[PDB]
Design an enzyme around this catalytic site. Structure first.
Site, PDB file in Angstrom:
ATOM      1  N   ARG A  78       0.829  -1.204   0.000  1.00  0.00           N
ATOM      2  CA  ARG A  78       0.000   0.000   0.000  1.00  0.00           C
ATOM      3  C   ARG A  78       0.867   1.260   0.000  1.00  0.00           C
ATOM      4  NH1 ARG A  78      -3.548  -0.212  -2.720  1.00  0.00           N
ATOM      5  NH2 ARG A  78      -4.752   1.536  -1.823  1.00  0.00           N
ATOM      6  N   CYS A 114       1.711   7.135   9.927  1.00  0.00           N
ATOM      7  CA  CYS A 114       0.632   7.994   9.456  1.00  0.00           C
ATOM      8  C   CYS A 114       0.007   8.777  10.616  1.00  0.00           C
ATOM      9  CB  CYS A 114      -0.444   7.152   8.736  1.00  0.00           C
ATOM     10  SG  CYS A 114      -1.094   5.723   9.680  1.00  0.00           S
ATOM     11  N   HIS A 128      -9.280   4.436  12.815  1.00  0.00           N
ATOM     12  CA  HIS A 128      -8.376   4.119  11.705  1.00  0.00           C
ATOM     13  C   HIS A 128      -9.019   3.141  10.710  1.00  0.00           C
ATOM     14  CE1 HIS A 128      -4.679   3.191   9.500  1.00  0.00           C
ATOM     15  NE2 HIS A 128      -4.045   4.119  10.199  1.00  0.00           N
TER      16      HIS A 128
END
Ligand SMILES: NC(=O)c1ccc[n+]([C@@H]2O[C@H](COP(=O)([O-])OP(=O)(O)OC[C@H]3O[C@@H](n4cnc5c(N)ncnc54)[C@H](O)[C@@H]3O)[C@@H](O)[C@H]2O)c1
Length: 334
Positions: free
Chosen positions: A10, A150, A177
Protein backbone atom coordinates in the site's frame (compact mmCIF):
# COMPACT_ATOMS: atom_id res chain seq x y z
CA UNK A 1 17.66 12.28 -6.55
CA UNK A 2 16.69 8.62 -6.95
CA UNK A 3 14.53 6.18 -4.99
CA UNK A 4 14.46 2.43 -4.44
CA UNK A 5 11.33 0.84 -3.01
CA UNK A 6 11.57 -2.28 -0.83
CA UNK A 7 8.05 -3.58 -0.38
CA UNK A 8 5.62 -2.68 -3.11
CA UNK A 9 2.52 -2.71 -0.87
CA UNK A 10 0.00 0.00 0.00
CA UNK A 11 2.74 2.45 1.01
CA UNK A 12 5.41 1.35 -1.47
CA UNK A 13 2.98 1.68 -4.39
CA UNK A 14 1.57 5.03 -3.25
CA UNK A 15 5.13 6.27 -2.72
CA UNK A 16 5.78 5.38 -6.42
CA UNK A 17 2.57 7.15 -7.47
CA UNK A 18 3.70 10.23 -5.51
CA UNK A 19 7.10 10.36 -7.28
CA UNK A 20 5.50 10.10 -10.73
CA UNK A 21 3.71 13.40 -9.90
CA UNK A 22 7.04 14.81 -8.74
CA UNK A 23 9.77 16.51 -10.83
CA UNK A 24 12.64 16.23 -8.33
CA UNK A 25 12.71 12.52 -7.48
CA UNK A 26 12.67 9.34 -9.56
CA UNK A 27 11.96 5.72 -8.67
CA UNK A 28 14.59 3.53 -10.32
CA UNK A 29 14.16 0.13 -8.62
CA UNK A 30 11.55 -1.99 -6.80
CA UNK A 31 12.02 -5.06 -4.61
CA UNK A 32 9.11 -7.34 -3.63
CA UNK A 33 9.62 -11.14 -3.40
CA UNK A 34 5.88 -11.81 -3.24
CA UNK A 35 5.02 -10.39 -6.65
CA UNK A 36 6.66 -10.99 -10.04
CA UNK A 37 7.04 -8.16 -12.58
CA UNK A 38 3.59 -8.96 -14.13
CA UNK A 39 1.83 -8.82 -10.74
CA UNK A 40 3.72 -5.63 -9.81
CA UNK A 41 2.48 -3.91 -12.97
CA UNK A 42 -1.14 -4.89 -12.24
CA UNK A 43 -1.08 -3.71 -8.61
CA UNK A 44 0.39 -0.44 -9.86
CA UNK A 45 -2.16 -0.03 -12.63
CA UNK A 46 -5.28 -0.75 -10.55
CA UNK A 47 -6.13 0.61 -7.10
CA UNK A 48 -9.39 -0.06 -5.21
CA UNK A 49 -9.07 3.27 -3.37
CA UNK A 50 -6.88 5.52 -5.51
CA UNK A 51 -8.06 4.71 -9.05
CA UNK A 52 -6.34 3.72 -12.29
CA UNK A 53 -2.63 4.72 -12.44
CA UNK A 54 -2.21 8.10 -14.22
CA UNK A 55 0.18 7.07 -17.02
CA UNK A 56 1.73 3.96 -18.60
CA UNK A 57 2.83 0.63 -17.07
CA UNK A 58 4.28 -2.22 -19.14
CA UNK A 59 6.49 -5.26 -18.51
CA UNK A 60 9.92 -5.21 -20.18
CA UNK A 61 12.65 -7.19 -18.36
CA UNK A 62 11.56 -4.86 -15.37
CA UNK A 63 8.81 -2.26 -15.49
CA UNK A 64 8.43 0.52 -17.98
CA UNK A 65 6.58 3.27 -16.12
CA UNK A 66 5.70 6.45 -18.05
CA UNK A 67 8.36 5.40 -20.59
CA UNK A 68 11.22 4.86 -18.12
CA UNK A 69 12.76 1.55 -17.02
CA UNK A 70 12.28 0.61 -13.39
CA UNK A 71 14.46 -2.28 -12.26
CA UNK A 72 12.61 -5.09 -10.53
CA UNK A 73 13.94 -7.50 -7.89
CA UNK A 74 12.44 -10.36 -5.84
CA UNK A 75 14.86 -10.90 -2.94
CA UNK A 76 13.89 -11.98 0.60
CA UNK A 77 17.08 -10.40 1.99
CA UNK A 78 17.70 -6.62 1.70
CA UNK A 79 21.45 -7.32 1.83
CA UNK A 80 21.04 -8.80 -1.65
CA UNK A 81 19.26 -6.03 -3.62
CA UNK A 82 21.80 -4.32 -5.89
CA UNK A 83 20.58 -0.76 -5.16
CA UNK A 84 23.93 0.78 -6.19
CA UNK A 85 23.99 -1.07 -9.51
CA UNK A 86 20.44 0.14 -10.22
CA UNK A 87 21.50 3.70 -9.32
CA UNK A 88 19.13 3.89 -6.34
CA UNK A 89 20.36 6.42 -3.72
CA UNK A 90 17.53 6.36 -1.15
CA UNK A 91 15.62 3.28 -0.08
CA UNK A 92 11.99 3.48 0.95
CA UNK A 93 11.82 0.57 3.42
CA UNK A 94 8.11 -0.34 3.33
CA UNK A 95 7.94 -4.11 3.91
CA UNK A 96 6.89 -3.58 7.52
CA UNK A 97 9.49 -6.13 8.64
CA UNK A 98 12.88 -4.37 8.76
CA UNK A 99 12.19 -1.58 11.28
CA UNK A 100 15.54 -1.54 13.13
CA UNK A 101 18.90 0.04 12.23
CA UNK A 102 20.33 -3.49 12.27
CA UNK A 103 17.87 -4.77 9.65
CA UNK A 104 17.35 -1.58 7.62
CA UNK A 105 21.12 -0.88 7.35
CA UNK A 106 21.58 -4.02 5.23
CA UNK A 107 20.22 -1.97 2.29
CA UNK A 108 23.59 -0.10 2.49
CA UNK A 109 25.44 -3.33 1.53
CA UNK A 110 23.70 -3.21 -1.84
CA UNK A 111 25.09 0.30 -2.26
CA UNK A 112 22.18 2.51 -1.17
CA UNK A 113 23.32 5.67 0.63
CA UNK A 114 20.26 6.28 2.84
CA UNK A 115 17.24 4.35 4.14
CA UNK A 116 13.87 5.72 5.23
CA UNK A 117 11.91 3.25 7.36
CA UNK A 118 8.23 3.70 6.51
CA UNK A 119 7.18 2.97 10.08
CA UNK A 120 8.08 3.84 13.65
CA UNK A 121 11.26 1.88 14.55
CA UNK A 122 11.50 -0.97 17.08
CA UNK A 123 14.76 0.73 18.15
CA UNK A 124 16.09 4.29 18.53
CA UNK A 125 16.41 5.12 14.81
CA UNK A 126 15.50 8.86 14.67
CA UNK A 127 11.93 9.70 13.60
CA UNK A 128 11.24 12.75 11.46
CA UNK A 129 7.96 14.50 10.71
CA UNK A 130 8.08 17.05 7.88
CA UNK A 131 7.27 20.57 9.02
CA UNK A 132 7.86 19.53 12.64
CA UNK A 133 11.42 18.29 13.26
CA UNK A 134 12.84 17.17 9.89
CA UNK A 135 15.60 19.82 9.87
CA UNK A 136 17.14 18.18 12.98
CA UNK A 137 18.36 15.46 10.62
CA UNK A 138 22.17 15.47 10.33
CA UNK A 139 23.43 13.48 7.29
CA UNK A 140 26.82 12.96 8.97
CA UNK A 141 25.11 11.28 11.94
CA UNK A 142 22.50 8.90 10.43
CA UNK A 143 22.13 6.63 7.36
CA UNK A 144 18.89 4.96 8.52
CA UNK A 145 15.96 7.16 9.50
CA UNK A 146 12.21 6.66 10.14
CA UNK A 147 9.26 8.64 8.71
CA UNK A 148 7.19 7.71 11.79
CA UNK A 149 3.63 6.48 11.23
CA UNK A 150 0.63 7.99 9.46
CA UNK A 151 -0.93 8.67 12.90
CA UNK A 152 2.19 10.47 14.21
CA UNK A 153 2.31 12.64 11.05
CA UNK A 154 -1.28 13.63 11.78
CA UNK A 155 -0.85 14.35 15.50
CA UNK A 156 2.64 15.92 15.62
CA UNK A 157 1.88 19.03 13.55
CA UNK A 158 -1.34 19.47 15.56
CA UNK A 159 0.48 18.91 18.90
CA UNK A 160 3.25 21.35 17.92
CA UNK A 161 0.79 24.12 17.00
CA UNK A 162 -1.22 23.59 20.21
CA UNK A 163 1.83 23.26 22.50
CA UNK A 164 3.65 26.31 21.10
CA UNK A 165 0.60 28.63 21.34
CA UNK A 166 -1.15 27.37 24.48
CA UNK A 167 0.92 24.59 26.07
CA UNK A 168 -0.31 21.00 26.40
CA UNK A 169 -0.42 19.98 30.09
CA UNK A 170 -1.70 16.44 29.43
CA UNK A 171 -3.16 14.71 26.36
CA UNK A 172 -4.80 11.38 25.44
CA UNK A 173 -5.37 10.28 21.81
CA UNK A 174 -7.69 7.91 20.02
CA UNK A 175 -7.23 7.29 16.35
CA UNK A 176 -10.25 5.90 14.49
CA UNK A 177 -8.38 4.12 11.70
CA UNK A 178 -9.31 2.50 8.38
CA UNK A 179 -8.35 -1.16 8.05
CA UNK A 180 -4.88 -2.16 6.89
CA UNK A 181 -3.09 -5.15 5.41
CA UNK A 182 -2.39 -6.78 8.80
CA UNK A 183 -6.13 -7.33 9.33
CA UNK A 184 -8.18 -10.33 8.16
CA UNK A 185 -11.35 -10.69 6.10
CA UNK A 186 -12.74 -13.37 8.47
CA UNK A 187 -11.89 -14.54 12.04
CA UNK A 188 -8.49 -16.25 12.00
CA UNK A 189 -5.12 -16.26 13.77
CA UNK A 190 -2.74 -13.27 13.73
CA UNK A 191 1.02 -14.03 13.51
CA UNK A 192 -0.06 -14.23 16.39
CA UNK A 193 -2.90 -8.85 18.47
CA UNK A 194 -5.81 -11.32 18.70
CA UNK A 195 -8.31 -8.49 18.06
CA UNK A 196 -6.66 -7.63 14.72
CA UNK A 197 -7.46 -11.09 13.34
CA UNK A 198 -11.21 -10.66 13.80
CA UNK A 199 -13.38 -10.22 10.68
CA UNK A 200 -12.35 -6.75 9.57
CA UNK A 201 -15.54 -5.87 7.71
CA UNK A 202 -18.12 -6.07 10.50
CA UNK A 203 -16.13 -5.10 13.59
CA UNK A 204 -15.11 -2.12 15.66
CA UNK A 205 -11.65 -3.27 16.81
CA UNK A 206 -9.51 -1.77 19.64
CA UNK A 207 -5.79 -1.63 18.84
CA UNK A 208 -2.57 -0.43 20.45
CA UNK A 209 -0.58 2.38 18.81
CA UNK A 210 2.64 4.11 19.82
CA UNK A 211 1.83 7.21 17.78
CA UNK A 212 1.11 9.62 20.65
CA UNK A 213 4.15 8.72 22.75
CA UNK A 214 6.15 8.96 19.49
CA UNK A 215 5.17 12.66 19.41
CA UNK A 216 7.20 12.88 22.68
CA UNK A 217 10.39 11.90 20.83
CA UNK A 218 9.63 14.05 17.78
CA UNK A 219 8.88 17.00 20.11
CA UNK A 220 10.91 16.32 23.30
CA UNK A 221 8.97 19.05 25.20
CA UNK A 222 5.95 16.68 25.10
CA UNK A 223 7.86 13.73 26.47
CA UNK A 224 5.56 11.97 28.99
CA UNK A 225 2.61 14.28 28.25
CA UNK A 226 0.86 12.14 25.62
CA UNK A 227 -0.36 8.64 25.01
CA UNK A 228 -3.05 6.90 22.98
CA UNK A 229 -4.82 3.97 21.40
CA UNK A 230 -6.45 3.14 18.08
CA UNK A 231 -9.82 1.84 16.97
CA UNK A 232 -9.83 -0.10 13.67
CA UNK A 233 -13.02 0.30 11.58
CA UNK A 234 -14.17 -1.40 8.29
CA UNK A 235 -13.48 1.50 5.84
CA UNK A 236 -10.73 0.90 3.19
CA UNK A 237 -8.91 4.27 3.57
CA UNK A 238 -8.69 7.47 5.66
CA UNK A 239 -8.36 7.88 9.42
CA UNK A 240 -9.02 10.43 12.19
CA UNK A 241 -7.15 11.70 15.27
CA UNK A 242 -9.26 12.40 18.34
CA UNK A 243 -7.05 14.39 20.72
CA UNK A 244 -8.30 15.13 24.25
CA UNK A 245 -6.01 17.61 25.97
CA UNK A 246 -5.71 19.93 28.99
CA UNK A 247 -4.15 23.28 28.05
CA UNK A 248 -1.87 25.47 30.23
CA UNK A 249 -3.40 28.67 28.87
CA UNK A 250 -7.11 29.03 28.05
CA UNK A 251 -8.13 28.62 24.40
CA UNK A 252 -11.51 28.54 22.72
CA UNK A 253 -12.09 26.30 19.70
CA UNK A 254 -11.99 29.51 17.63
CA UNK A 255 -8.53 30.51 18.97
CA UNK A 256 -7.21 26.99 18.33
CA UNK A 257 -8.66 27.19 14.81
CA UNK A 258 -6.74 30.46 14.17
CA UNK A 259 -3.46 29.02 15.48
CA UNK A 260 -3.98 26.06 13.14
CA UNK A 261 -4.81 28.38 10.22
CA UNK A 262 -1.72 30.52 10.89
CA UNK A 263 0.62 27.50 10.77
CA UNK A 264 -1.19 25.93 7.77
CA UNK A 265 -0.74 29.13 5.76
CA UNK A 266 2.84 29.77 6.90
CA UNK A 267 5.49 27.42 8.39
CA UNK A 268 3.43 24.23 7.87
CA UNK A 269 2.25 24.95 4.30
CA UNK A 270 1.25 21.62 2.69
CA UNK A 271 1.54 19.70 5.98
CA UNK A 272 -1.13 21.21 8.23
CA UNK A 273 -4.52 21.95 6.64
CA UNK A 274 -7.93 22.97 8.02
CA UNK A 275 -11.65 22.94 7.18
CA UNK A 276 -14.89 24.28 8.61
CA UNK A 277 -16.97 22.07 6.28
CA UNK A 278 -19.30 19.14 7.04
CA UNK A 279 -16.63 16.67 5.93
CA UNK A 280 -16.47 12.88 6.19
CA UNK A 281 -13.54 10.44 5.76
CA UNK A 282 -13.93 9.78 1.99
CA UNK A 283 -13.57 13.55 1.43
CA UNK A 284 -9.86 13.06 2.22
CA UNK A 285 -9.09 10.18 -0.15
CA UNK A 286 -6.10 11.54 -2.07
CA UNK A 287 -5.45 14.41 0.36
CA UNK A 288 -1.72 15.19 0.52
CA UNK A 289 -1.83 17.01 3.91
CA UNK A 290 -0.47 15.28 7.03
CA UNK A 291 -3.24 16.61 9.26
CA UNK A 292 -6.54 18.32 8.43
CA UNK A 293 -8.13 20.15 11.39
CA UNK A 294 -11.93 19.70 11.42
CA UNK A 295 -13.25 22.85 13.14
CA UNK A 296 -16.90 21.85 13.52
CA UNK A 297 -16.17 18.35 14.80
CA UNK A 298 -14.15 19.69 17.75
CA UNK A 299 -15.85 20.23 21.12
CA UNK A 300 -14.79 21.95 24.33
CA UNK A 301 -15.79 21.12 27.88
CA UNK A 302 -14.41 24.52 29.05
CA UNK A 303 -11.63 27.00 28.12
CA UNK A 304 -9.01 24.46 29.30
CA UNK A 305 -10.16 20.96 28.37
CA UNK A 306 -10.76 20.23 24.72
CA UNK A 307 -11.36 17.52 22.14
CA UNK A 308 -9.74 18.16 18.77
CA UNK A 309 -10.39 16.25 15.55
CA UNK A 310 -7.87 15.93 12.69
CA UNK A 311 -8.17 13.85 9.51
CA UNK A 312 -5.49 12.03 7.55
CA UNK A 313 -5.30 9.89 4.47
CA UNK A 314 -3.13 7.25 6.10
CA UNK A 315 -2.07 5.83 2.74
CA UNK A 316 -1.68 8.87 0.52
CA UNK A 317 -0.73 11.66 2.95
CA UNK A 318 1.97 9.56 4.57
CA UNK A 319 3.40 8.42 1.23
CA UNK A 320 3.74 12.03 0.07
CA UNK A 321 5.51 12.85 3.34
CA UNK A 322 7.92 9.96 2.78
CA UNK A 323 8.65 11.41 -0.66
CA UNK A 324 9.03 14.89 0.87
CA UNK A 325 11.50 13.45 3.37
CA UNK A 326 13.52 11.64 0.68
CA UNK A 327 13.69 14.86 -1.35
CA UNK A 328 14.72 16.65 1.86
CA UNK A 329 17.39 13.99 2.66
CA UNK A 330 18.86 14.27 -0.88
CA UNK A 331 19.12 18.07 -0.62
CA UNK A 332 21.20 17.68 2.57
CA UNK A 333 24.01 15.66 0.93
CA UNK A 334 24.08 11.97 -0.06
N1 LIG B 1 -1.13 1.52 4.95
C1 LIG B 1 -1.08 2.45 5.91
O1 LIG B 1 -2.19 3.08 6.38
C2 LIG B 1 0.29 2.79 6.49
C3 LIG B 1 0.53 4.10 6.88
C4 LIG B 1 1.75 4.48 7.43
C5 LIG B 1 2.75 3.54 7.59
N2 LIG B 1 2.52 2.21 7.20
C6 LIG B 1 3.62 1.25 7.41
O2 LIG B 1 4.26 1.08 6.14
C7 LIG B 1 4.74 -0.32 6.06
C8 LIG B 1 3.97 -1.09 4.98
O3 LIG B 1 2.56 -0.86 5.11
P1 LIG B 1 1.48 -1.34 3.99
O4 LIG B 1 0.16 -0.89 4.48
O5 LIG B 1 1.97 -0.93 2.65
O6 LIG B 1 1.61 -2.93 4.12
P2 LIG B 1 1.38 -3.98 2.87
O7 LIG B 1 1.20 -5.36 3.47
O8 LIG B 1 0.40 -3.48 1.88
O9 LIG B 1 2.80 -3.87 2.15
C9 LIG B 1 3.93 -4.62 2.57
C10 LIG B 1 4.70 -5.09 1.34
O10 LIG B 1 6.04 -5.57 1.67
C11 LIG B 1 6.25 -6.81 0.94
N3 LIG B 1 7.34 -7.62 1.59
C12 LIG B 1 7.21 -8.51 2.58
N4 LIG B 1 8.40 -9.03 2.90
C13 LIG B 1 9.30 -8.48 2.10
C14 LIG B 1 10.68 -8.63 1.97
N5 LIG B 1 11.36 -9.49 2.75
N6 LIG B 1 11.32 -7.91 1.04
C15 LIG B 1 10.66 -7.05 0.26
N7 LIG B 1 9.34 -6.89 0.35
C16 LIG B 1 8.63 -7.59 1.27
C17 LIG B 1 4.86 -7.46 0.91
O11 LIG B 1 4.73 -8.38 -0.20
C18 LIG B 1 3.94 -6.25 0.71
O12 LIG B 1 3.81 -5.96 -0.68
C19 LIG B 1 4.49 -0.92 7.44
O13 LIG B 1 5.62 -0.59 8.25
C20 LIG B 1 3.25 -0.15 7.90
O14 LIG B 1 3.15 -0.15 9.31
C21 LIG B 1 1.28 1.81 6.65
Amino acid sequence: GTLGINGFGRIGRLVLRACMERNDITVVAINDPFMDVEYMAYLLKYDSVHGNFNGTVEVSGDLCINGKVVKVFQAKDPAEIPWGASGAQIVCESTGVFTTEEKASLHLKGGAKKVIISAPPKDNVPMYVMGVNNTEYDPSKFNVISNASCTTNCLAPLAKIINDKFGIVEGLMTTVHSLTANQLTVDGPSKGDWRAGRCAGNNIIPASTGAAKAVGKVIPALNGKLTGMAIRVPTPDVSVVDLTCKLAKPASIEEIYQAVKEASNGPMKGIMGYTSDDVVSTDFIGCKYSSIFDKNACIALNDSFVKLISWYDNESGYSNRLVDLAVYVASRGL
